[PDB]
Amino acid sequence: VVVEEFDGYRQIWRKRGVMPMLRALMSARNIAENLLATAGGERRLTDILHISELLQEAGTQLESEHALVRWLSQHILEPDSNASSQQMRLESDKHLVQIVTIHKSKGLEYPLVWLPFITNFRVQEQAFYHDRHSFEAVLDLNAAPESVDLAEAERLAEDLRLLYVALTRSVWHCSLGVAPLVRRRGDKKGDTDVHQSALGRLLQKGEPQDAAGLRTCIEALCDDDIAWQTAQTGDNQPWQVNDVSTAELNAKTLQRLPGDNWRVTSYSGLQ
Amino acid sequence: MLRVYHSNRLDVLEALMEFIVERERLDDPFEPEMILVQSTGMAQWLQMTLSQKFGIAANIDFPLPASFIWDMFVRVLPEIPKESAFNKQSMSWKLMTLLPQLLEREDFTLLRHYLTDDSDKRKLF
Amino acid sequence: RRGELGFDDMLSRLDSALRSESGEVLAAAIRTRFPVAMIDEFQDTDPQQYRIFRRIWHHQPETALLLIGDPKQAIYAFRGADIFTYMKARSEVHAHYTLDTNWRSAPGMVNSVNKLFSQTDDAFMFREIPFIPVKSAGKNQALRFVFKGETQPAMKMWLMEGESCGVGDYQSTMAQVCAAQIRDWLQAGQRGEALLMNGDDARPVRASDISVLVRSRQEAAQVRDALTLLEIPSVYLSNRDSVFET
Amino acid sequence: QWEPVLTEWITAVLQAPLNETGVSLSQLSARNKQVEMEFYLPISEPLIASQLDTLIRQFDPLSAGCPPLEFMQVRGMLKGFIDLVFRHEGRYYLLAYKSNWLGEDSSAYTQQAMAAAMQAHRYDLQYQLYTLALHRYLRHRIADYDY
Amino acid sequence: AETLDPLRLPLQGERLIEASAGTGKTFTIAALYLRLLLGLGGSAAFPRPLTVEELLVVTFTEAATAELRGRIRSNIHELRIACLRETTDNPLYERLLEEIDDKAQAAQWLLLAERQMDEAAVFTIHGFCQRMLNLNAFESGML
Amino acid sequence: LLSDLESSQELDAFVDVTPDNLLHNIQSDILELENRAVAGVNIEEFSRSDNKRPLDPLDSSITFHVCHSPQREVEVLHDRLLAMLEEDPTLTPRDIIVMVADIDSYSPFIQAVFGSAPADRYLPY
Amino acid sequence: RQLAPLGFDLMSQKPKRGDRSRRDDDRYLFLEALISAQQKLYISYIGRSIQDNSERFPSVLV
């Protein structure tokens, strides 16, 4: 019976196309209702629908039937990102915590913003800077320390601009994660590298200090809007679902045929 | 006499054309009836409506206005061939030969700066 | 040879056309075409673009040039933008105009931003990028994120306690602290304790209000794994992965 | 290489008269001929094959064999392209062209073989629709018309 | 530096507007677009009023250009309605209506701007470069 | 250009449309050459709103639809055409036309949503 | 549908009565589509983006 219904699916796929075969497969097996009943299967169903739409979009431009299978296997083997072949949002009705990068948050708006890794910084190694007089891009192929310092200054300015972009997106409340982060491989050297970051250059006023110095620089700028608290590790209970029931709904059914046999044919149509 | 028929919809104009044809019959039966249209769907709808009104719709020619005007140019004035010498492809293949000959003029220095930089006979065509 | 073109190839062709001698007259044709220019987002300006705009609209009469931008938002240096082009443009032009009023955030967050970035002189470490204190809106001065206890302040710098910490451990601890704060805001938000108050109007805090701002994909996955452990679903808006890789 | 045999074959076609009186194609003027007449024929009833094939077999003698074709109820318009219509001595005539003729190479294309080809390819319905269209055309065009 | 007013900006030479984060940049752009369309400002105004096909707006993001085109179309329609009614509900629109002396010619110009809004010259950078390369192909040398 | 002809004979056959529906209202306003748009120059015309034409809430002649994708757009269009075929007992699919701005972009989606319908739901296209 | 002119065409410089452009032809096509509709007129446009849920404005004629 399975082989017979798959041969019928092959006949529909050869006569009507991709999306009619996929719709008959999802309606006869009723896999869409089972994926909607399963928790966490709505994203899988939207991915299946997008893959079906892309297969129907690529199947009209191809004549052979195996060519679409080879195209699908190639696009599986090719992870290249196009504007049409990207993953979409799975759901819009259910509210979710929206994680967004700093470059993708330019011009947006969020009520409450949490910045856990605003103190993490990365040191630029290559020597590609700009001159302070001619304002031209200078690429130094030799490992000169002046070019490395002039590139690290532009890296720190870019980190400060990223800090201002990430700070100016909160509306009501923003929370920051501060820690004496040390990029150096030594664990206890007596000094931390927060002055090498963008936040510590404003907290420690561009001066290298310690964890107690960072804490005193944090507690120095204490106002009604700016406060600090210690990091508490602890969990009591995850959450409460508080689900609600769904009202009854039905679908209308067509009473008659949509149209009579009206067609403008020729003698070859009647033979 | 040139008759202009203003109407709000097209069914009144089709009924007026049916009344004109049924009112004044053609003296020559094999003479085609020239109905000037612009697209093929308009001529197909006119053929279907004339077949619905008359029972038949045959020997009705639907030419272009330019084709009918050139046919009247041929029929009225003699010593004129059926095809025009000045067409798009003919003038293009003529100008592809004529433009290198006219590059030495002072008026064509802009086309010389556009053409004589690099040319594998792509910008010229 | 193939006759194809690219996105930057149009800029290079226009710069090479204006670089020639006859193309200056072509620029006059552009002065015949549009005798005005209003260029938005001038922080994302390549030097070829500013060279073109200086070739066309430098000092000719009756033509106006309006460079509307922001040097404090130039974060696309990885894409091809450059703040030194903006500094050259600021050195070339004479007049400067700024927008004083801010219509988005609460005045507490505005005062926190104007307090943090005006601690020292030249906080952006460049002479041609000055910072000015912006002003909050009059209609949004009653915005308050209130907790069960009292009115929560605007900026809360969660200082992780310790002498020295690594990278993965610091990320894990701050992700756990952020997930604990998220679950505390969602647990108190569904009972009418944590609210967003505009004047006297109140709104409970749902899961769509809290957003975590990360910079990389690894720390975004760390935040998502630390948040999905406490039965809190979260979406990743910057997910650019292909559907064919699942 | 086929060209010098084809033109003499064409003149051999043109020299052969096709009429019951012996009228050739060279006697037809340009105003008398009309090539590729396109007609549209309306039908408002559902075309039943059983009510049509019996009406054909009642009068057409070639429908002794030829078991009836099956087609759906066609209501609407019918297109047709007649090859040639020409008048001569005050009488109208129709002419169509069939040129496949793969199975014949000898002189066996007599009237019996042509009637068998007409019964096999079912050109009787096409010729009957052509006669109906020509009758309606001569009724609409020429006043005081008799079939 | 000085503060920026959209109804007092001199539109001569080169000007540098620094719009901070969260400020009404798209509103100031629409206000300057209406100022360039109606020719307002007095001594700091343009020497002649310009049409929709003469105002060039360059923005990088395509969605930003579409949003700005829709907002400028809505502002043109609202200002046409407020000029036909001699009243409005916006204070900037009130000052814009107070700056003009004539109402019929301004309403006719806003109607012609609404009808010519499809041919507006609000493009991106690469789109403007492609349009200038395809338009004057002789002096540039583009296919 | 037609009115400038000297020996032209102008005939007018305009059938008036009774304005009952919204589409018939628009066609009557176009044919009669009148301005029904209320500007509201005074506050008395701006306060009252009964000076306009009343539009019945069951008048489904002209409807505007907002969709999210070319697939969902024609998926909504198919259901709306089925509702229109169910609303009127005498309605032919030949009398229904669908015009798109670009045929090649939407034609895969149209064929996809028109082929997927079952036998009780399938309309010929 | 906008089709830009060639730039060196003289008909676009000095327009006459009998000149034809694609924009005016499309506007007259929309007028003929409004007039030719007898019973029901259906209009559907993409209003929200499928990628980023951005608002897509309709045409000026609608």
Swiss-Prot record, chain B:
Belongs to the RecC family. A helicase/nuclease that prepares dsDNA breaks (DSB) for recombinational DNA repair. Binds to DSBs and unwinds DNA via a rapid (>1 kb/second) and highly processive (>30 kb) ATP-dependent bidirectional helicase. Unwinds dsDNA until it encounters a Chi (crossover hotspot instigator, 5'-GCTGGTGG-3') sequence from the 3' direction. Cuts ssDNA a few nucleotides 3' to Chi site, by nicking one strand or switching the strand degraded (depending on the reaction conditions). The properties and activities of the enzyme are changed at Chi. In the RecBCD complex, RecB has a slow 3'-5' helicase, an exonuclease activity and loads RecA onto ssDNA, RecD has a fast 5'-3' helicase activity while RecC stimulates the ATPase and processivity of the RecB helicase and contributes to recognition of the Chi site. The chain holds residues 1 to 125 of 1122 of the full protein. The holoenzyme may undergo conformational shifts upon DNA binding: the nuclease domain of RecB may swing away from the DNA exit tunnel in RecC. When Chi DNA binds to the RecC tunnel, the nuclease domain may then swing back to its original position (that seen in crystal structures), allowing it to nick the DNA 3' of the Chi site and then rotate to load RecA. At high Mg(2+) the nuclease domain may swing back more frequently, explaining differences seen in assays performed at high Mg(2+). The gene is recC. This is RecBCD enzyme subunit RecC. Heterotrimer of RecB, RecC and RecD. All subunits contribute to DNA-binding. Interacts with YgbT (Cas1). Changing residue 70 to A: Does not act at Chi. Changing residue 64 to A: Does not act at Chi. It comes from Escherichia coli (strain K12).
From Swiss-Prot, chain E:
It comes from the Bacteria. Changing residue 25 to Q: Subunit loses ATPase and 3'-5' helicase activity, holoenzyme has 3-5 fold less helicase activity, 20-fold less processivity. Transmembrane segments: none annotated. A helicase/nuclease that prepares dsDNA breaks (DSB) for recombinational DNA repair. Binds to DSBs and unwinds DNA via a rapid (>1 kb/second) and highly processive (>30 kb) ATP-dependent bidirectional helicase. Unwinds dsDNA until it encounters a Chi (crossover hotspot instigator, 5'-GCTGGTGG-3') sequence from the 3' direction. Cuts ssDNA a few nucleotides 3' to Chi site, by nicking one strand or switching the strand degraded (depending on the reaction conditions). The properties and activities of the enzyme are changed at Chi. The N-terminal DNA-binding domain (residues 1-929) is a ssDNA-dependent ATPase and has ATP-dependent 3'-5' helicase function; both are stimulated in the presence of RecC, suggesting this domain interacts with RecC. Holoenzyme reconstituted with this RecB N-terminal fragment has no nuclease activity. The C-terminal domain (residues 928-1180) has weak ssDNA endonuclease activity as an isolated fragment. RecD probably interacts with this domain. The C-terminal domain interacts with RecA, facilitating its loading onto ssDNA. Interaction is decreased by ATP. Heterotrimer of RecB, RecC and RecD. All subunits contribute to DNA-binding. The C-terminus interacts with RecA. Interacts with YgbT (Cas1). (Microbial infection) Lambda virus GamS protein interacts with the enzyme without displacing any of the subunits. Belongs to the helicase family. UvrD subfamily. This is RecBCD enzyme subunit RecB. It comes from Escherichia coli (strain K12). The lineage of its organism: Bacteria, Pseudomonadati, Pseudomonadota, Gammaproteobacteria, Enterobacterales.
Curated annotation (Swiss-Prot), chain F:
Disruption phenotype: Decreased degradation of DNA with free ends that is unable to undergo homologous recombination, which can fortuitously lead to more efficient viral infection. Cells are deficient in DNA recombination repair and have increased sensitivity to UV light. The cultures have many inviable cells. Cells can be transformed with retron Ec48-containing plasmids. Disulfide bonds: none annotated. Coiled coil: none annotated. The holoenzyme may undergo conformational shifts upon DNA binding: the nuclease domain of RecB may swing away from the DNA exit tunnel in RecC. When Chi DNA binds to the RecC tunnel, the nuclease domain may then swing back to its original position (that seen in crystal structures), allowing it to nick the DNA 3' of the Chi site and then rotate to load RecA. At high Mg(2+) the nuclease domain may swing back more frequently, explaining differences seen in assays performed at high Mg(2+). In the RecBCD complex, RecB has a slow 3'-5' helicase, an exonuclease activity and loads RecA onto ssDNA, RecD has a fast 5'-3' helicase activity while RecC stimulates the ATPase and processivity of the RecB helicase and contributes to recognition of the Chi site. Belongs to the RecC family. Heterotrimer of RecB, RecC and RecD. All subunits contribute to DNA-binding. Interacts with YgbT (Cas1). (Microbial infection) Lambda virus GamS protein interacts with the enzyme without displacing any of the subunits. This is RecBCD enzyme subunit RecC. The lineage of its organism: Bacteria, Pseudomonadati, Pseudomonadota, Gammaproteobacteria, Enterobacterales.
